[PDB]
Design a protein around this ligand. Structure first.
Ligand SMILES: O=C(CO)[C@@H](O)[C@@H](O)[C@H](O)COP(=O)(O)O
Ligand SMILES: O=P(O)(O)OC[C@@H]1C[C@@H](O)[C@H](O)O1
Ligand SMILES: OC[C@H]1O[C@@H](O)[C@H](O)C[C@@H]1O
Lengths: 472, 472
């Protein structure tokens, strides 16, 4: 978007739809595969041509300046940083131009004014999401040890106006989190209690997003309170077997757990997300050749009865000798031909199973055992494998089982003081000669700085006020 | 204020009126502008000649020994400390002299004895107020981090006798709060249930004052119980628009929310309080040139429909370019000439909107959601902008909107674990080139010692038993 304030409701709504079209390609599963692969869950395969290995084996020399953000490619660490700043920039343009349009009294009636204020609240949630996704990967956790002098308590460059080419320093962690949380807070007051559409920002998604941020911050009482606002509003998938689970889970339209998602059809909004499964169409069947596969400990986390053991992960590597992360396989509603797989999925922004997990973790931390027991037993049972002992260990295992492929594990390891024990893990025995037994290039102990990414090299070169994260 | 006991009821009543005359110049809005400006709500303007900047930009070197308390000036931190210690001293003389008169049986009948005991109870409320106003600015909050060794659990010098030149150590926090609360408790038992006059200490003001102290201490159950005693006794201003709100609000005589205030007329009791609005008379016009203005986030707390957006703050900076705090503009009843502004206000000691806010916060803390919802919706609606979602964030916003200019925010930031994020805040865009973009001279994170003031330098030099607050 641009710098000219809006002159009509139609113009405002068109730019609002423009912002959701951008969100679909930003808050996308393809942007979270990098943080996913950097966790302690995967090993590379012989199919990997040093593409996923820098994240998997913690190759610090490559990760330092990883990715691209130019006219020909937007990928990796540099691509992630670019798309979330571009999302923040366009949400700024939308928010400021709607605020100006409201101040200039350009709307025709009270309905246009009320709806424009509501759109403005949706924009604020997207400003909070963009700045938080930058905080999540480019600001350090409190537990970090050695860091570049002055970076420990720094956030990100906090820019509130559509201003490309801006040269400024990083704001503090407190300043960035105060802005994220004030945005969500101001939005929750305007957005109606009941969700208008699964395709648009709602008060339900604002509570879910804030619950996620509070959990990440270790604010368990506040995470539990936000989680309780939406946890009972979305029912879990009701499935008698794995086949019924797959057909509902893989359906954007029919899955009752989705709170917010991006528009998708066979012609618009659909995209392949084959990084983790290395899947390709082969007539009416699907060929698999992954570049990274989970370790045996990840496979053994699931009971054979668990519906996610043939959906989230699938024994499809080399026909049937190993397991592959098949969460983003397809939504058959986005096929061009009914019987021909094209492996197209839609962008999902929040689902109730993540809210259940935020609630269980936060309840265990605040000593609310009945709440932890109710929601952990409910989620695991619906998945076909009920947990028998509800404790922090069972939450850690069920959270890992549920959010595999979604880039949660790297964050979870840091919050749970889990070092990367990659070198000690047993690879899948049926994948001998395919799965790599490559050791970490750099060890990742509790508090290691490289759990946080370095700011892209171009940005560090053009902005002398930007303080880098990594020492040495 | 002598050491000689009273010999008659007339003498007792004359000294009681002398104490209220002193209170007017002590518990005055001019003494609370310093703690107001030290909060996260203002930036300085180019009109500031380093007068308000030491508080706004946390210039510790100046704040350390700030103000004056001599025959020519009583101002700043040293002036605040002086005035409340003088109020405590004269309240002591009054209390001790009335107790002696009752013991010496100098009164004519049982009515004189009963009225003198009631006056004695009013004096006790004023001793509690003087010592609490000293605790509020010179004793540390429980959350404080590094301090001068031995200062963390100290109160203030607790002197109960009219004794000038007294050299003594600071009492503990427990000793000072036990004295504050025992004085209020003993007064509440004597003062009649129904207020005799808005101009004199009542049981209503003693409950409001104790509710304020309990909230400051985090004693939410006790604050809520004390607030419920008075919150329904004073109706809120009923106004159809901002003009009607302004005419009732600015009227000491006609505002139904005032529980206690000092006598004021054009010739006695009136005073200008132009620090925050930089207002000056110019014939029939009012010229504004403020030295500090709120940040844009403060202006944004208010909906355009909110009556406080043109009374508490008003868009009168550079004719109509920006907002200043206009709460203490004037009471037109204190004008010398009907059509000529002289900007004189009266000293207000408690209003029911503060009692509503104490109740809402305390209810949110004790899980009494119906009470929080009832009183937060009632106050915000009467102000022309009803809150739709009642939560902690709504209370913090509502309290900040309502108590702006009254020196509540510094205290509130500390109780709510809010650090000073001044450096990240956007200044009012129409005030570019007027509003200063100056960063804090010292950061103020959660628990920083400088949230509490240092004891005046002259007192630290003449009293070797006085332990200072600030480290380094
Ligand atoms: O303030 C009050 C009541 O709050 C009055 O009891 C007191 O101020 C008298 O007006 C004293 O009169 P003077 O000595 O001439 O100032
Ligand atoms: O998000 P902003 O910049 O408007 O900051 C508003 C916040 C809310 C308040 O608690 C803090 O002082 O600042
Ligand atoms: O004037 C509109 C404003 O309303 C307030 O209640 C919010 O804090 C921010 C918003 O910009």
């Amino acid at each position: 978007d641009f710098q000219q304030p809006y002159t009509s409701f139609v113009q405002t709504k068109q730019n609002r739809d423009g912002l959701y079209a951008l969100l679909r390609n930003t808050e996308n599963p393809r942007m979270h595969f990098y943080q996913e692969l950097q966790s302690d869950m995967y090993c590379t395969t012989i199919t990997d041509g040093n593409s996923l290995a820098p994240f998997v084996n913690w190759d610090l020399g490559i990760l330092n300046d990883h990715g691209r953000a130019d006219e020909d490619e937007v990928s990796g660490i540099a691509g992630y940083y670019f798309v979330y700043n571009r999302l923040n920039q366009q949400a700024n343009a939308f928010v400021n131009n709607t605020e100006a349009a409201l101040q200039n009294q350009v709307y025709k009636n009270s309905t246009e004014i009320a709806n424009a204020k509501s759109f403005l609240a949706e924009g604020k949630v997207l400003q909070a999401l963009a700045i938080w996704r930058l905080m999540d990967r480019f600001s350090f956790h409190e537990s970090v040890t050695e860091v570049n002098s002055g970076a420990k308590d720094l956030g990100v460059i906090l820019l509130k106006e559509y201003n490309p080419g801006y040269i400024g320093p990083r704001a503090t962690k407190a300043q960035c989190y105060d802005y994220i949380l004030s945005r969500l807070s101001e939005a929750i007051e305007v957005l109606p209690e009941n969700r208008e559409s699964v395709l648009y920002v709602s008060r339900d998604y604002a509570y879910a997003l804030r619950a996620r941020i509070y959990l990440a911050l270790g604010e368990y009482g506040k995470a539990a309170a936000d989680a309780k606002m939406v946890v009972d509003k979305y029912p879990l998938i009701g499935a008698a077997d794995a086949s019924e689970f797959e057909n509902i889970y893989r359906s954007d339209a029919n899955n009752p757990e989705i709170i917010f998602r991006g528009f998708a059809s066979a012609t618009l909004g659909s995209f392949t997300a084959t990084t983790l499964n290395g899947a390709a169409p082969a007539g009416k069947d699907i060929k698999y050749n992954p570049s990274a596969v989970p370790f045996q400990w990840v496979v053994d986390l699931y009971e054979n009865e668990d519906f996610r053991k043939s959906v989230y992960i699938a024994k499809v590597v080399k026909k049937d000798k190993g397991y592959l992360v098949n969460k983003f396989l397809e939504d058959k509603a986005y096929r061009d031909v009914q019987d021909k797989p094209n492996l197209k999925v839609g962008a999902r922004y929040f689902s109730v199973a993540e809210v259940y997990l935020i609630l269980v973790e936060s309840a265990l931390q605040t000593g609310d055992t009945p709440t932890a027991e109710k929601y952990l037993k409910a989620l695991s049972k619906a998945r076909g494998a009920e947990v028998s002992v509800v404790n922090m260990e069972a939450l850690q295992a069920e959270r890992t089982r549920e959010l595999i492929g979604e880039g949660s594990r790297l964050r979870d390891m840091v919050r749970w003081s889990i070092p990367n024990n990659h070198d000690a893990f047993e690879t899948q025995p049926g994948l001998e000669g395919f799965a790599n037994t490559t050791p970490l290039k750099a060890q990742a102990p509790v508090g290691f700085y490289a759990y946080t990414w370095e700011f892209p090299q171009r940005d560090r070169q053009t902005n002398p006020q930007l303080i880098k994260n990594w020492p040495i």
